[PDB]
Amino acid sequence: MTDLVAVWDVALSDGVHKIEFEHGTTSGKRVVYVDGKEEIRKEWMFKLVGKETFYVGAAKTKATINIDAISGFAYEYTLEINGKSLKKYM
């Protein structure tokens, strides 16, 4: 996972899940892994900002990763599940 930018460790109704996100800032590639399995892949995109939505665990809990621009030509990555959220950036 050479473009890994964020990892979230969450506890849902059905146990703990690991969500990993790769984001390529030259290619625009996005990959979301949940519990080691690819759930979303976008190989190549012009734009970097936006959101991906996907479903986690046996109960298919909705999760959204938002990608927003911040200072210094950087991005922040926010995972939101059930109205709570945790931001990552480097």
Side-chain angles (χ1 to χ4, degrees), residues 4-84:
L4 187 64
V5 296
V7 174
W8 296 263
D9 303 300
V10 298
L12 304 174
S13 57
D14 70 325
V16 306
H17 292 97
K18 192 177 280 283
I19 298 156
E20 293 161 294
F21 185 54
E22 287 192 87
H23 186 30
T25 57
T26 289
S27 57
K29 177 185 76 175
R30 298 176 180 180
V31 192
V32 176
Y33 305 83
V34 179
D35 298 336
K37 167 175 201 217
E38 166 188 304
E39 282 295 313
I40 296 195
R41 173 169 291 267
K42 302 272 185 90
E43 190 57 23
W44 196 94
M45 297 180 36
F46 279 99
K47 75 186 180 177
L48 294 193
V49 303
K51 72 170 183 189
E52 290 301 337
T53 303
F54 50 96
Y55 298 89
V56 175
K60 298 300 179 176
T61 297
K62 189 175 180 187
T64 291
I65 291 170
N66 268 268
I67 302 168
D68 292 301
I70 58 172
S71 304
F73 237 131
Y75 299 87
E76 75 175 4
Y77 297 95
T78 298
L79 175 70
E80 185 183 17
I81 296 177
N82 293 335
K84 301 284 180 35

